C-alpha cells in the first residue's frame, strides 16, 4: 500500500522485552571471521 504511513510510530514500547530468549543461540556462525 503506497499510502501507508512511512514515519516511525513514537508510541512503540521503549522498554526492554523480558520475553526475549535468554538462551544462547546454537545457530550462530562457528567459523572464524576472515573479514
Amino acid at each position: 500500500d503506497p499510502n501507508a504511513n512511512p514515519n516511525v510510530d513514537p508510541n512503540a514500547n521503549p522498554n526492554v522485552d523480558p520475553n526475549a530468549n535468554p538462551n544462547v543461540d546454537p545457530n550462530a556462525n562457528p567459523n572464524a571471521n576472515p573479514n
Epitope: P2, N3, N5, P6, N7, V8
Partner: antibody, heavy 124, light 106 residues
C-alpha cells in the same frame, strides 16, 4: 528550520543515468520518510517515489516504475534518487520534500517542508 | 488513480476581496487533501493539510473546507503577498496533484 537542498542536476543525453542527492538538516532524519516530487511546466506537480524511515519499503510512480531507484543513508542524512535510462519525458524540476509536519498516524502523505529543487534536462 | 481537477483555471480578484477556489476529485478522498502555495521561482508551501487544519505559521486568512469529492479553499481578504497559483493534492489513494489555479490581480 527544516532545510532541504537538492543537487545532482544538469543536462544528460537520453538513455543515460543521472543521480540526485538531497541533504536534510534541522530535524531527526532517521525518524521520518522522504519523498521525491516532479514539477513539469504545462503538467503540474507529479509524484515520483516514497521511501520508508529506514528504507524498508519503497514505492514508485507508474511513470517511473522499474527505472528510478530511491535510497537513503541515515548516517549521512541524505536522500538519493537514481534515475536510470532517462527519457525526454523526464525533463522537469525535481523536489525533495518531507512527509508531514509532525507525526500523525491517520494523516500521512502530505508535504510539509519542500526543498528549492534541482533541474534535470534530457535532450540531445 | 484519482484524477484531480480545479476550476476555474484563473481568478481575477482585487486585493482585500474574498477569493474562492474549488477542487474536485474523480473519486472520494475522505479527509486526506492538502493545498500548496506556488510562487514564481519558489517551492510549494503547505497551507492546509487533511481537510481544514492549517500548517504552523500560516495565518488564519487561509481557510479550507470540504469533504468527499468537493473541496474549497477560501481567502477571507486576499493580500498582496498571496497572489500565486494554488495546487490541490489528494493522498487517500496514491499521490496525485491538480492542474493548479492561479490568482491574478483584477
Amino acid at each position: 528550520q527544516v532545510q532541504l537542498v537538492e543537487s545532482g542536476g544538469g543536462v544528460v543525453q537520453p538513455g543515460r543515468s543521472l543521480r540526485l542527492s538531497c541533504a536534510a538538516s534541522g530535524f531527526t532524519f532517521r525518524n521520518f520518510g522522504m519523498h521525491w516530487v516532479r514539477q513539469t511546466p504545462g503538467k503540474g506537480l507529479e509524484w515520483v517515489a516514497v521511501i520508508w524511515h529506514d528504507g524498508s519499503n519503497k514505492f514508485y510512480a507508474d511513470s517511473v516504475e522499474g527505472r528510478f531507484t530511491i535510497s537513503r543513508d541515515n548516517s549521512k542524512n541524505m536522500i538519493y534518487l537514481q534515475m536510470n535510462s532517462l527519457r525526454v519525458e523526464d525533463t522537469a524540476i525535481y523536489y525533495c520534500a518531507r512527509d508531514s509536519l509532525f507525526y500523525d498516524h491517520d494523516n500521512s502523505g502530505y508535504y510539509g517542508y519542500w526543498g528549492q529543487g534541482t533541474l534535470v534536462t534530457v535532450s540531445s | 488513480q484519482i484524477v484531480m481537477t480545479q476550476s476555474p483555471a484563473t481568478v481575477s480578484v482585487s486585493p482585500g476581496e474574498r477569493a474562492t477556489l474549488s477542487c474536485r476529485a474523480s473519486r472520494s478522498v475522505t479527509s486526506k487533501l492538502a493545498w500548496y502555495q506556488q510562487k514564481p521561482g519558489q517551492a510549494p508551501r503547505l497551507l492546509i493539510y487533511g481537510a481544514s487544519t492549517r500548517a504552523t505559521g500560516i495565518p488564519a486568512r487561509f481557510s479550507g473546507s470540504g469533504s468527499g469529492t468537493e473541496f474549497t479553499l477560501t481567502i477571507s481578504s486576499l493580500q498582496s503577498e498571496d497572489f500565486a497559483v494554488y495546487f490541490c493534492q489528494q493522498y487517500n489513494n496514491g499521490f496525485t496533484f491538480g492542474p493548479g489555479t492561479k490568482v491574478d490581480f483584477k
